[PDB]
Amino acid sequence: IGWRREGIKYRRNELFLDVLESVNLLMSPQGQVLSAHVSGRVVMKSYLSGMPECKFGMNDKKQSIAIDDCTFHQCVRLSKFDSERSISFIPPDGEFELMRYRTTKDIILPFRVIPLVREVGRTKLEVKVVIKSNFKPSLLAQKIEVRIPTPLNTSGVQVICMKGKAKYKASENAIVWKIKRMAGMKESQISAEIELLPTNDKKKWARPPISMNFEVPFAPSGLKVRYLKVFEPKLNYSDHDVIKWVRYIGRSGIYETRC
C-alpha cells in the first residue's frame, strides 16, 4: 500500500467522522422551490493501529436518503460498493477525504424566509422579514445572517429586531441581520423603514433576492452515518475498542429567496 505505512501504533485508537454539507437553494416569491442541491464531503480523522480494513455505512437507498452520484478516495474498493452498498477500505493515517457527493432529492431546508414589502408612497418602504427554523428544536443553528438588499436611492434605514442585531451597510446596499444562535422550529422577524430619495422614475427597481448564510449541526441532505466498522486481524484489538466520533456541519451555499 502506497498511502499507508505498515507499522503504525496507537495506544488510544480513535476516529472522527465529519459530514460536511453545503446546502444550496433558490426559492420563488410564492414558496415554490426553483432549484436545490447539496454538495457534501465526508472527511475521516483516524488514529488506528496497524492496517485495518474499514467498512463504512450510511442510509444509502429510521430513514433512507438517496445519493445521486459520488466519488471516493482511491483507498476504497470501488467494486466492494459496486454490488453490496458496502463502502470498504483501509484508511490512510491522519486526516483524509473519504468521498465527495451531491444530493437533490428530499432536502431539508434549515430556514424559510418570508419577505413582506409595502410601498408607503414615493418616500418610504415598510418591510418585514420572518425567518423560520425548520429542524429539530434540540439543535442550534448558529452564524445566521439575513441579507436584505436595499434600493440605490436610499437615504437612511431604521430597523427593529427583537432577536439578533442589524446594520445597514450602505456601501453594499443591503441590510445585514445577524443572529448568533437560533433553535429549531422558531420564528424571528425584523422590521425596517427605508427612507427614499427621488429617483429617475422610469429607471425602476427589481427586488433582488434575500440571501442567507447559516451553519447547522446536521446534514441537510438527510444523510446519517450508521457504522464505521474497523477490523484488524493481526492485532489484539477489535471494534468495541475503537473510540468513534461523528459530527455534522451543514453550511449555507447559495441560499436566495426571491422577493
Binding site: 467522522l17 449541526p217 452515518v225 457504522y227 464505521l228 473510540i243 468513534k244 466520533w245 461523528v246 459530527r247
Partner: peptide, 6 residues
Amino acid sequence: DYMPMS
C-alpha cells in the same frame, strides 16, 4: 459537535 457513535 462531535457525538459518539452508538
